[model samples]
Target: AQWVPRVDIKEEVNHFVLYADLPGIDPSQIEVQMDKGILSIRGERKSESSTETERFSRIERRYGSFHRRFALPDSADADGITAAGRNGVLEIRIPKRPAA
Candidate 1:
């Protein structure tokens, strides 16, 4: 039941944006980190808590831990990282700087 949440990346003129699809997952449980210009995202999905498991007919959703890492360029600003989770989607924005 190990699953990696899908994502959509957008390279903007002034910033880099990433949207992660994390439905049924709490945003509070998500973790974003940066180290040596590398960006990482981490999250975990727990199975439904129930006492009676007799009517479970369809199990399509995956559960477990998932993480992703991306190497940023020299122009990538690591000091200021913005993140927001809304409507079950995680939005991460990283500002960019001139490489000169």
Candidate 2:
């Protein structure tokens, strides 16, 4: 199964910030790319292993691959984008171009 991470986006005068909630995800597992004006974030969450000795009463967390895409604005400096993952959250910053 595939799940989508909750995301929050904010725009400031000089840049845009994006925060995505990705619990139990590693920074190396996440992929961010900007191509043809589209910004895409992709990742996967693996399911926990269970043995016959122990059974899970409930499994609420979603797992598997996830993908998100956004169309960048003209003011966005796609080449200047940066991403980092910390405390189960992925943060992305995209600087804006100077006014023409």
Candidate 3:
């Protein structure tokens, strides 16, 4: 079995909000990058620890490095992107620049 993660995006009047479901993810291990109008999110989850070695009876959740990219418009302010994690939910806010 392999590990896979998913993300959700929301559009706001002044910014784009990204809500990511990252259970058991360490905040220090998360990485966010922006380049050429593309925003990237990448992170790795700590491997599970077991007291005793035994064959897996059942497995459902995935765990590993996950990545997601978002395209920003001219109004999107990549430089001011803010992110925070609370109760296993990762919140990302991308500020938007007003039209000049």
Identify the leading candidate in terms of TM-score: 2
Better of 1 and 2 by TM-score: 2
Alpha-carbon runs more than 4 Å astray in model 1: 49-54
- What Cα-based lDDT does every candidate model obtain? 0.78, 0.81, 0.73
- In candidate 2, stretches whose alpha carbon ends up further than 4 angstroms from where it belongs are 49-54
- The TM-score measured for candidate 1 stands at 0.82
| lDDT (tens digit, per residue) of candidate 2 on 9-94 | 88878887888888899977889887766678899887783234257777777777899998877777778888999998999888
Alpha-carbon shift of residue 34 in model 3 (angstroms): 1.5
Cα displacement (angstroms), candidate 2, residue 58, comes to 1.6
Structural similarity to truth (TM-score) of each candidate = 0.82, 0.85, 0.81
Clashes of each: 0, 0, 0
Best candidate (score: lDDT) = 2
* lDDT by residue (tens digit), candidate 3, 1-100: 2345567888798888888888787665668777777778788775553323255666565776677777867677778889888876778888876641
lDDT of model 2, residue 76? 74
List ranges where model 3 is wrong by over 4 Å: 49-55
Residue 13, candidate 1: C-alpha displacement in angstroms:
1.2
